[PDB]
Design an enzyme around this catalytic site. Structure first.
Site, PDB file in Angstrom:
ATOM      1  N   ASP A 234      29.624  37.132  36.867  1.00 14.62           N
ATOM      2  CA  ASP A 234      30.081  38.414  36.339  1.00 14.62           C
ATOM      3  C   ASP A 234      31.561  38.637  36.643  1.00 14.62           C
ATOM      4  OD1 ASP A 234      30.007  41.436  35.817  1.00 14.62           O
ATOM      5  OD2 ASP A 234      27.880  40.951  35.507  1.00 14.62           O
TER       6      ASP A 234
ATOM      7  N   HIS B 161      32.105  46.020  36.676  1.00 12.60           N
ATOM      8  CA  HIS B 161      30.777  45.785  36.118  1.00 12.60           C
ATOM      9  C   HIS B 161      29.936  44.903  37.034  1.00 12.60           C
ATOM     10  CE1 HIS B 161      28.138  43.319  33.485  1.00 12.60           C
ATOM     11  NE2 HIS B 161      27.991  44.402  32.742  1.00 12.60           N
TER      12      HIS B 161
ATOM     13  N   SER C 285      23.265  44.782  29.999  1.00 13.22           N
ATOM     14  CA  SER C 285      23.765  44.344  31.302  1.00 13.22           C
ATOM     15  C   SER C 285      23.005  44.958  32.456  1.00 13.22           C
ATOM     16  CB  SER C 285      25.222  44.737  31.484  1.00 13.22           C
ATOM     17  OG  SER C 285      26.073  43.772  30.925  1.00 13.22           O
TER      18      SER C 285
END
Ligand SMILES: [Ca+2]
Ligand SMILES: [Ca+2]
Ligand SMILES: [Ca+2]
Length: 354
Positions: free
Chosen positions: A42, A116, A288
């Protein structure tokens, strides 16, 4: 079993409502194992006070220093420096970010840092039952941060190398990973049919014993349209909401394996709009967010029975999923086997006489 964290009650995805994953039943069996490692492949991580204790040394596979935003190419520090993109950067025809992200009309746009990877990592394994912040699915499991996404995203080659390294396979120029991961979380993707670069890496890590969990994508489009969600030998995850209904944005199609909480998901974040600032918590939407509910559930399944194979893991995830409610907008041909149920999926290995 429920943890005492201040914000856990807002994490509907863990609870036993019509749309939730029913974690308290699973947590009566196991709250995780530090010998089970989940890779979050990520944007990197922040050492949030409600996360850092569960974070292992990882790696940063972003090859381009401009995207990497940390002063160099590949490196052994998977901390997230921020992935913001300014309007001047995306509009500079002579710059490395020219037209790197476009909206529906083909127009450029700017973005603040997403953090994120910190949000996703918190769903897998925020520090839990510590009287503050949020909980994670695996309280005692470890998280391997593998940074592959930077400013305006990441490259296919960097992501596939991060996948190999995460599972304990060799990557040229990188040291061996002493913390191989059995569950790999990919809350990311891009357009086009599944590239051989992805499929080779996926097959290599699956044969090494890892389970690859991937976000279906957020374009209200066929899941066939997004890689690695459209690859073989992965678990593609669609997003549903607190009522068990299809998220408006989720991709769908026959390749989706299961649906999981993906709308209004609270987790760990950071307040910085560019470089890191203060720890925070934030609610995000996306496939996600659904992906780490599944990957975290697999981490608990393995903590409870370390002998399960990737094939057995997928079969149990699908067999234990709850049927979609009437009017959900979901079916077993579009949103996978049903709604994720960790309480039903997590099953202790047999006990035996001594
Ligand atoms: Ca770097
Ligand atoms: Ca770095
Ligand atoms: Ca906490």
């Amino acid at each position: 079993l429920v943890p005492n964290d201040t914000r856990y009650s807002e994490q509907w995805g863990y609870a036993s409502g019509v749309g939730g994953a029913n974690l308290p039943k699973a947590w009566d069996i196991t709250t995780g194992s530090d010998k089970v490692v989940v890779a979050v492949v990520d944007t990197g991580y922040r050492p949030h006070a409600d996360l850092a204790a569960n974070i292992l040394p990882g790696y940063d596979f972003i090859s381009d220093p401009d995207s990497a935003n940390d002063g160099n190419g590949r490196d052994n520090n998977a901390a997230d420096p921020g992935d913001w993109v300014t309007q001047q950067e995306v509009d500079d025809p002579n710059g490395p970010f020219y037209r790197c992200q476009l909206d529906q009309f083909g127009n450029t746009f700017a973005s603040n840092s997403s953090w994120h990877g910190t949000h996703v990592a918190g769903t897998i394994g925020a520090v839990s039952n510590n009287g503050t912040g949020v909980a994670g699915i695996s309280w005692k499991g470890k998280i391997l941060p593998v940074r592959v996404l930077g400013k305006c995203g990441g490259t296919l080659s960097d992501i596939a190398d991060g996948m190999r390294w995460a599972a304990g396979l060799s990557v040229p120029g990188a040291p061996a990973n002493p913390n191989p991961a059995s569950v790999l979380n990919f809350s990311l993707g891009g357009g086009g049919s599944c590239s051989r670069t992805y499929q080779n890496a996926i097959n290599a890590v699956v044969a090494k014993g890892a389970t690859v969990v991937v976000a279906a994508g957020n374009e209200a489009s066929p899941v066939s349209s997004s890689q690695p969600a459209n690859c073989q030998n992965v678990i593609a995850v669609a997003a549903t909401d607190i009522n068990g209904r299809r998220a408006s944005f989720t991709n769908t199609g026959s390749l989706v394996k299961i649906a999981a909480p993906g709308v209004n998901i609270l987790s760990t974040l950071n307040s910085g709009t560019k470089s890191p600032a203060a720890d925070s918590y934030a609610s995000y939407n996306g496939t996600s967010m659904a992906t780490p509910h599944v990957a975290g559930t697999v981490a608990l399944m393995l903590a409870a029975n370390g002998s399960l194979t990737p094939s057995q893991i997928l079969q149990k995830l699908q067999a234990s999923a709850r049927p979609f409610p009437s009017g959900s907008g979901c079916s077993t041909s579009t949103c996978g086997a049903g709604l994720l149920d960790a309480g039903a999926a997590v099953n202790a290995a047999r006990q035996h006489h001594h």
